[PDB]
Design an enzyme around this catalytic site. Structure first.
Site, PDB file in Angstrom:
ATOM      1  N   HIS A  61       0.895  -1.129   0.330  1.00 50.49           N
ATOM      2  CA  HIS A  61       0.120  -0.014  -0.006  1.00 50.49           C
ATOM      3  C   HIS A  61       0.858   1.418   0.045  1.00 50.49           C
ATOM      4  O   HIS A  61       0.335   2.138  -0.416  1.00 50.49           O
ATOM      5  CB  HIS A  61      -0.797  -0.015   1.396  1.00 50.49           C
ATOM      6  CG  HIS A  61      -1.782  -1.254   1.468  1.00 50.49           C
ATOM      7  ND1 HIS A  61      -1.444  -2.105   2.367  1.00 50.49           N
ATOM      8  CD2 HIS A  61      -2.991  -1.885   0.698  1.00 50.49           C
ATOM      9  CE1 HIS A  61      -2.336  -3.283   2.413  1.00 50.49           C
ATOM     10  NE2 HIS A  61      -3.197  -2.837   1.319  1.00 50.49           N
ATOM     11  N   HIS A  91       6.187   6.900   6.539  1.00 45.03           N
ATOM     12  CA  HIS A  91       5.819   6.480   4.998  1.00 45.03           C
ATOM     13  C   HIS A  91       4.892   7.654   4.482  1.00 45.03           C
ATOM     14  O   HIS A  91       4.941   8.817   5.174  1.00 45.03           O
ATOM     15  CB  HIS A  91       4.627   5.472   4.883  1.00 45.03           C
ATOM     16  CG  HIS A  91       3.231   5.642   5.730  1.00 45.03           C
ATOM     17  ND1 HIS A  91       3.308   5.595   7.195  1.00 45.03           N
ATOM     18  CD2 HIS A  91       2.309   6.380   5.601  1.00 45.03           C
ATOM     19  CE1 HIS A  91       2.156   6.138   7.610  1.00 45.03           C
ATOM     20  NE2 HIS A  91       1.208   6.487   6.578  1.00 45.03           N
ATOM     21  N   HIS A  93       1.816   9.147   1.372  1.00 44.96           N
ATOM     22  CA  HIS A  93       1.016   9.083   0.583  1.00 44.96           C
ATOM     23  C   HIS A  93       1.293   9.974  -0.605  1.00 44.96           C
ATOM     24  O   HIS A  93       1.481  11.147  -0.381  1.00 44.96           O
ATOM     25  CB  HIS A  93      -0.279   9.236   0.978  1.00 44.96           C
ATOM     26  CG  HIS A  93      -0.716   8.552   2.424  1.00 44.96           C
ATOM     27  ND1 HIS A  93      -1.396   7.520   2.447  1.00 44.96           N
ATOM     28  CD2 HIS A  93      -0.189   8.777   3.563  1.00 44.96           C
ATOM     29  CE1 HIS A  93      -1.562   7.061   3.716  1.00 44.96           C
ATOM     30  NE2 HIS A  93      -0.723   7.817   4.332  1.00 44.96           N
ATOM     31  N   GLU A 103      -3.192  13.791   1.762  1.00 47.74           N
ATOM     32  CA  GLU A 103      -4.334  13.049   2.173  1.00 47.74           C
ATOM     33  C   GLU A 103      -5.162  14.345   3.089  1.00 47.74           C
ATOM     34  O   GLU A 103      -6.194  14.789   2.532  1.00 47.74           O
ATOM     35  CB  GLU A 103      -4.059  12.280   3.674  1.00 47.74           C
ATOM     36  CG  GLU A 103      -3.524  10.970   2.446  1.00 47.74           C
ATOM     37  CD  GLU A 103      -3.733   9.601   3.163  1.00 47.74           C
ATOM     38  OE1 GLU A 103      -2.946   9.631   4.546  1.00 47.74           O
ATOM     39  OE2 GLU A 103      -4.217   8.771   2.791  1.00 47.74           O
ATOM     40  N   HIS A 116       3.943  11.034   6.663  1.00 48.69           N
ATOM     41  CA  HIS A 116       3.545  10.684   8.034  1.00 48.69           C
ATOM     42  C   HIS A 116       4.538   9.974   8.955  1.00 48.69           C
ATOM     43  O   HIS A 116       5.123   8.815   8.464  1.00 48.69           O
ATOM     44  CB  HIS A 116       2.484   9.767   7.854  1.00 48.69           C
ATOM     45  CG  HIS A 116       1.227  10.244   7.039  1.00 48.69           C
ATOM     46  ND1 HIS A 116      -0.039   9.598   6.609  1.00 48.69           N
ATOM     47  CD2 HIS A 116       0.849  11.564   7.149  1.00 48.69           C
ATOM     48  CE1 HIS A 116      -0.711  10.576   6.280  1.00 48.69           C
ATOM     49  NE2 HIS A 116      -0.443  12.069   6.495  1.00 48.69           N
ATOM     50  N   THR A 195      -5.281   6.643   8.564  1.00 47.44           N
ATOM     51  CA  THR A 195      -5.929   6.990   7.123  1.00 47.44           C
ATOM     52  C   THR A 195      -6.142   5.949   6.371  1.00 47.44           C
ATOM     53  O   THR A 195      -6.560   5.746   5.158  1.00 47.44           O
ATOM     54  CB  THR A 195      -5.357   8.165   6.264  1.00 47.44           C
ATOM     55  OG1 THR A 195      -4.023   7.634   5.957  1.00 47.44           O
ATOM     56  CG2 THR A 195      -5.229   9.529   7.103  1.00 47.44           C
ATOM     57  N   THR A 196      -5.455   4.744   6.809  1.00 49.22           N
ATOM     58  CA  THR A 196      -5.523   3.279   6.073  1.00 49.22           C
ATOM     59  C   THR A 196      -6.227   2.241   7.044  1.00 49.22           C
ATOM     60  O   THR A 196      -6.176   2.298   8.119  1.00 49.22           O
ATOM     61  CB  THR A 196      -4.190   2.716   5.772  1.00 49.22           C
ATOM     62  OG1 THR A 196      -3.319   3.015   6.886  1.00 49.22           O
ATOM     63  CG2 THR A 196      -3.628   3.500   4.506  1.00 49.22           C
TER      64      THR A 196
HETATM   65  C1  LIG Z   1       0.219   2.196  10.301  1.00 57.13           C
HETATM   66  C2  LIG Z   1      -0.033   3.430   9.928  1.00 57.13           C
HETATM   67  C3  LIG Z   1      -0.210   4.389  10.814  1.00 57.13           C
HETATM   68  C4  LIG Z   1      -0.792   5.689  10.202  1.00 57.13           C
HETATM   69  C5  LIG Z   1      -1.089   5.912   8.984  1.00 57.13           C
HETATM   70  S1  LIG Z   1      -1.572   7.514   8.571  1.00 57.13           S
HETATM   71  N1  LIG Z   1      -1.085   4.993   8.246  1.00 57.13           N
HETATM   72  O1  LIG Z   1      -1.519   5.087   6.920  1.00 57.13           O
HETATM   73  C6  LIG Z   1      -0.354   3.614   8.590  1.00 57.13           C
HETATM   74 ZN   LIG Z   2      -0.379   7.377   6.392  1.00 52.02          ZN
END
Ligand SMILES: Cc1ccc(=S)n(O)c1
Ligand SMILES: [Zn+2]
Length: 257
Positions: A61, A91, A93, A103, A116, A195-196
Site C-alpha cells: 500500500h 511513510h 501517500h 490526504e 506521516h 488514514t488506512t
Molecule cells: C500504520 C499506519 C499508521 C498511520 C497511518 S496514517 N497509516 O497510513 C498507517
Molecule cells: Zn499515512
C-alpha cells in the site's frame, strides 16, 4: 482485501472497517480561516538526534521506513501532547500527478504527497497496545510540493528499486529523518484516525503548515513502485491517499497566529 482501486478503494472500506464512518476519521480538509490559534499549545519538540532506522518495506500500500523503538531514541512531545511519543515508522501517500496526492488538504488545496511520521505514546508500552487507546498515536504530517529536490529524501528514493513489489524489504540503516523536516514547526492539530485500514481512532494529528519541496524526479521514482507482488500484473503504486472525511464535531487548532 482493501486497496485504492475502483473495487476495493476508500468508498468500500467501511464494509470491512465500519469505523470508516466513525466520529473522528482522517484525513480532513484544514480550513485555515476556521482553525483557531491556541496560545496554550506548547512548542512542538522533535528529538530525532538518536533515531535508529532499520529497514524499508513495500507493504503493498506504501513503503514504510522502520525504526528501532525499543528505547527512547526519537521522540515527539510538547505541542498538543501529554507525555512522550516514540517514532516507529514513517511513510508517504502520493498521487499519479503532481496536483494530487496528499490526504490532508489546506483550504481544499491538494499537495503532491504527504509524509506521516508515526509515533506511539510510551505510557502504553508498545505500538500494539497504543492502537487500542484514543491517545495512543501522534502522527506528524508534512506536505510535499514539487520544486527543488529535498536532499535528505534522496537516500529513500535511491533504495526504492530494491523494494519494487509487495512484500520486498531492504536494510535501511543510519537514515536521518531530520533531513525530511521543513524550517518551521508551525502546525495545525486535531484528533483523528489512521488514514488506512484498520482506520483506528487513536491519532493526535500534528500537520505542519510549511511544506517541503521535492523534485519532480524524486516523486516520479515513488510512482514506479508497485502495489502488486513480484510475478503479478503490474499495478503502479500511485494515488494511495484517502480523500478528506467529514469534520463532524471537531475543532482544528493552530499553533501560530
Ligand atoms: C500504520 C499506519 C499508521 C498511520 C497511518 S496514517 N497509516 O497510513 C498507517
Ligand atoms: Zn499515512
Amino acid at each position: 482485501h482493501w486497496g485504492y482501486g475502483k473495487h476495493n478503494g476508500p468508498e468500500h472500506w467501511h464494509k470491512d472497517f465500519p469505523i470508516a464512518k466513525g466520529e473522528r476519521q482522517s484525513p480532513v480538509d484544514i480550513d485555515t480561516h476556521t482553525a483557531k490559534y491556541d496560545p496554550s499549545l506548547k512548542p512542538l519538540s522533535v528529538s530525532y538526534d538518536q533515531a535508529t532506522s532499520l529497514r524499508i518495506l513495500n507493504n503493498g500500500h506504501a513503503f514504510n521506513v522502520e525504526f528501532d523503538d525499543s528505547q527512547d531514541k526519537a521522540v515527539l512531545k510538547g505541542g498538543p501532547l501529554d507525555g512522550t511519543y516514540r517514532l516507529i515508522q514513517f511513510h508517504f501517500h502520493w498521487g499519479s500527478l503532481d496536483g494530487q496526492g496528499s490526504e490532508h488538504t489546506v483550504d481544499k488545496k491538494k499537495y503532491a504527497a504527504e509524509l506521516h511520521l508515526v509515533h506511539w505514546n510510551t505510557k502504553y508500552g508498545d505500538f500494539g497496545k497504543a492502537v487500542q487507546q484514543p491517545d495512543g498515536l501522534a502522527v506528524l504530517g508534512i506536505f510535499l510540493k514539487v520544486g527543488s529536490a529535498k536532499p535528505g529524501l534522496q537516500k529513500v528514493v535511491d533504495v526504492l528499486d530494491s523494494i519494487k513489489t509487495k512484500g520486498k524489504s531492504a536494510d535501511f540503516t543510519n537514515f536521518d529523518p531530520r533531513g525530511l523536516l521543513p524550517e518551521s514547526l508551525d502546525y495545525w492539530t486535531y484528533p483523528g484516525s489512521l488514514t488506512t485500514p484498520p482506520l483506528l481512532e487513536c491519532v493526535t494529528w500534528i500537520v505542519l503548515k510549511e511544506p517541503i519541496s521535492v523534485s519532480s524526479e524524486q516523486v516520479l521514482k515513488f510512482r514506479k513502485l508497485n502495489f502488486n507482488g513480484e510475478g503479478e500484473p503490474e499495478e503502479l503504486m500511485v494515488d494511495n491517499w484517502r480523500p478528506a472525511q467529514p469534520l463532524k464535531n471537531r475543532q482544528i487548532k493552530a499553533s501560530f497566529k
